[PDB]
Structures are given as structure tokens and as C-alpha cells.
Amino acid sequence: TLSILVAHDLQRVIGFENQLPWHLPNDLKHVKKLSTGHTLVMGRKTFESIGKPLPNRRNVVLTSDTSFNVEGVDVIHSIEDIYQLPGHVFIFGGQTLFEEMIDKVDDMYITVIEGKFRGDTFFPPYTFEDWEVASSVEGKLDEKNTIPHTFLHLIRKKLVPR
Ligand SMILES: NC(=O)c1ccc[n+]([C@@H]2O[C@H](COP(=O)([O-])OP(=O)(O)OC[C@H]3O[C@@H](n4cnc5c(N)ncnc54)[C@H](OP(=O)(O)O)[C@@H]3O)[C@@H](O)[C@H]2O)c1
Numbered sequence: 001t002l003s004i005l006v007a008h009d010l011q012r013v014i015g016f017e018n019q020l021p022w023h024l025p026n027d028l029k030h031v032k033k034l035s036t037g038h039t040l041v042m043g044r045k046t047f048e049s050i051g052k053p054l055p056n057r058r059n060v061v062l063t064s065d066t067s068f069n070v071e072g073v074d075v076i077h078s079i080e081d082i083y084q085l086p087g088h089v090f091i092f093g094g095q096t097l098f099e100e101m102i103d104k105v106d107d108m109y110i111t112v113i114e115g116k117f118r119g120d121t122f123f124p125p126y127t128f129e130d131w132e133v134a135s136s137v138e139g140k141l142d143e144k145n146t147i148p149h150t151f152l153h154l155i156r157k158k159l160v161p162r
């Protein structure tokens, strides 16, 4: 099973200057809960943004750099390699990988950041015409989590004759 895992704002911004534009602890907890025990596939720039592999899960980094070899990270050099990874694979970012994989994945776990941030990287456009909302859950707010956000689980709709 192959899934997208992403947070994007009301304009589909996902990043600014190789960082998340928002500070939202709850969403990182969301990521931790969904991806723990499973596999993360991310592009080279996304990895360097995090700097280290995330614990208790397989970290896979896609890069053309044959010299890439980081402790705790498996490396792949093409998209085709993704499909031979076992278990639940989460496409973890960033913009380039999302663009390459949005037409290939079974489902998407999207955190809609209900605000407008300055960004320089975006999630590709998509329509709910093509995706069923398996679940939609408002994130709870507090003094440490102040930006409204909604957790979506979207599943690709089957094309049928009507
Ligand atoms: N949910 C979120 O909000 C979220 C999640 C993740 C990341 N982000 C953000 O996304 C932004 C980064 O996105 P990005 O598009 O600039 O970078 P990216 O997708 O993380 O990394 C791009 C790099 O991935 C490698 N790559 C991608 N496709 C490849 C292929 N087919 N074959 C070989 N290598 C491939 C290349 O690395 P080489 O150049 O080394 O070959 C490419 O330069 C950051 O701002 C980050 O904050 C946001």
C-alpha cells in the first residue's frame, strides 16, 4: 500500500526556504503516529531539512547522488525503486516527489493547515471530484497549537461508466 503524507495550507503551500512554514506540534505527532513502524520515502532536500532520519521507521531517501550514504538511511536512485519497497510506504515529500507520485498513490493523508502562509514549494492541485473523503477530523487547538487544521484521509475514486 502506497500513500502520500503531507501538510499543506489553504493555497497548497507545503514549504518555505526548505522548512515548514508553520509551527504545529500536533501535526508532527500526527506524522509520528501514522508512519511509525512503516516506511518513509523522501527527496534529498526534504531529508536535509530534517537533517537526521526519523526514529523507529525505515527512512528512504531518493537522490541522484551516488555518493549519498547516511547512517540510518536507505538510498534509492529512481522512482521505480519505490515500488519494490515492502509494507506501508508513505511518500513524505517534498514538492518534486509529490508531483511525481500523486497520480500513483492509493490514498493521501493530508493535514490542511487552515491558513495562508508564504511559501516557495507547493503540493500539486487535486480535486475532491477525484478523491473520496474517508475521514475528516478537526485538530484540537491549544496555546501551543494555535493554527486551525484538519486531518483528511483521502482515497482515490474508481472511474466507472455513468
Ligand atoms: N508536508 C509538508 O508540508 C512537507 C513535507 C515534506 C517536505 N516539505 C517541504 O518541501 C520542500 C522541498 O521540496 P523540493 O521539491 O524542493 O525537494 P524534495 O522533493 O524534498 O527533494 C528534491 C530532490 O529529490 C531528488 N529526487 C527527486 N526525484 C528524483 C528522481 N526521480 N530521481 C532521482 N532523484 C530524485 C533530487 O535530489 P538530488 O538533487 O540530490 O538528485 C531532487 O533534487 C521543503 O521546503 C520542505 O520544507 C513539506
Ligand SMILES: COc1ccc([C@H]2c3cc(OC)c(OC)cc3CNN2C(=O)CCc2cc(Cc3cnc(N)nc3N)cc(OC)c2OC)cc1
Pocket: 005, 006, 007, 018, 019, 020, 025, 026, 027, 028, 029, 031, 032, 036, 046, 049, 050, 054, 055, 056, 091, 092, 093, 110, 111
Ligand atoms: C512536538 O511533537 C513532536 C515533535 C517532533 C517530532 C519528530 C519526531 C521525534 C521522534 O523522536 C522522539 C520520533 O520518534 C518516533 C518521531 C518523530 C516524528 N516527526 N518528527 C520530526 O521532527 C519530523 C518533522 C518534519 C516533517 C516533515 C514532512 C511532513 C510534515 N507534516 C506532514 N503532515 N507530513 C509530512 N510529510 C517535514 C519537515 O521539514 C521539512 C519536518 O521537520 C520540521 C514528533 C513529535
